[PDB]
Design a protein around this ligand. Sequence first.
Ligand code: HEM
Ligand code: HEM
Ligand code: DMU
Ligand code: ZN
Ligand code: ZN
Length: 360
Amino acid sequence: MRPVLVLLHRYVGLATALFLFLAGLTGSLLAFHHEIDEWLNPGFYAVGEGGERLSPGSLVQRVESRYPRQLVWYMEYPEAGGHPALLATVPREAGAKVEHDVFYLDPVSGEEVGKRLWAACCFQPANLVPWVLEFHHNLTLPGNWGLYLMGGVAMFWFLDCFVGAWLTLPNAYRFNFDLHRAGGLWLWLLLAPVALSSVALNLPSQVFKPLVSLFSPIEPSVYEARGRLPREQLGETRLDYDRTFQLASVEAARLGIAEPIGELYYSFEYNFFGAGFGDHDDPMGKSWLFFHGSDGRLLGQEVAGQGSWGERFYRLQYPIHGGRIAGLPGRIAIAALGLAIAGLSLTGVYIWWRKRRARH
Ligand code: HEM
Ligand code: HEM
Ligand SMILES: CCCCCCCCCCO[C@@H]1O[C@H](CO)[C@@H](O[C@H]2O[C@H](CO)[C@@H](O)[C@H](O)[C@H]2O)[C@H](O)[C@H]1O
Ligand SMILES: [Zn+2]
Ligand SMILES: [Zn+2]
């Protein structure tokens, strides 16, 4: 059964071609997606000249009341000798227009030191890195319409990878074919985990966690779990950010979560808070704890390095996709593969073109 898999590659690799192309090339750009912004957008990464930082709830209230038709749901809370606190917002009137959407505050004086609107188109200073980063996984399509597409392209790319891994395991046309061929089993093996983590990153609840669950049990998120609750049971929101940060340090004591609280999260839709420990430069050591909006009780824990095989195999996908599992080498590594993939998806559509040139 040799040519059956050969046909199965040509039909797959070509459907994938320009999606995988766009996706991977932009992904290379995103290899330094934090770094690019700091170069492009240095106001957002100010110095914060001060001593004692004011409480996460304090910084929230600044933003919620200077912008009375907006609400803070995610915020990055720094250690005050560093980057400006990041508070992210959403309309209060459901589908209202807002001029700005993410806020940078000095964490010692809540005074705004930069604003941004998320993903306006290519605008070099500020909406570039967000736009590339949301175009990359969704080709900026209407909503999940196409988040699904790019995740599907991911699914075929992975399936095509473990076909190619079996099929290959123990001129203009002359040169394009030779370049493309040159990957070997080595390159097919590199491709496989970028595709797999792609599946994880776009269709986590839908494909990847249900498929892994056959091999080890994946507890769903608190977010998965409360999306599935009957709405009357959700309760009414009584906590605030400060009350959460207390509760998470109380719980962090108990579980031995070493790291410090850096992110705080609240979701309207399901009435719960999130306190996430550790910085974005070591995403493998980040933990999360989620608390009920009314009780303050612990709804779920995602303590890094802990859980079931399937669960920590999930939390490795985002570190694997971004190279961070291998440090700056790996980031450089991934920045390379996305270029390779671009090359592949091109050279491979060409050897279709010039094969089709005989019919011309
Ligand atoms: C990295 C390892 C890869 C290897 C070893 C590889 C190998 C090949 C080979 C040897 C062909 C020969 C064409 C033929 O025999 O008929 C081919 C065709 C092709 N491959 Fe790849 N491939 C790789 C990755 C990719 C990727 C990532 C894509 C797209 C993203 C891709 C897209 C294509 C396409 C479109 C063709 C079309 C040729 C046709 O229609 O006949 N390949 N592949
Ligand atoms: C060419 C292959 C790909 C490469 C090299 C690549 C690379 C990357 C990189 C480096 C990141 C950033 C990780 C980090 O910030 O730490 C990223 C983000 C992401 N990737 Fe990919 N990627 C590729 C393909 C895909 C595919 C095919 C999909 C889905 C079909 C996908 C979905 C995503 C998602 C959802 C994110 C998260 C970005 C965000 O938060 O907005 N990737 N990609
Ligand atoms: C053309 C598109 C192709 C799509 C291919 C991927 C579809 C995968 C579905 C496989 O079937 C699943 O079996 C899982 C059970 O083993 C269930 O997971 C559920 O049950 C698990 C525990 O059994 C937990 O992971 C979760 O609570 C939960 O997601 C889940 O309901 C069900 O769908
Ligand atoms: Zn980042
Ligand atoms: Zn930084």
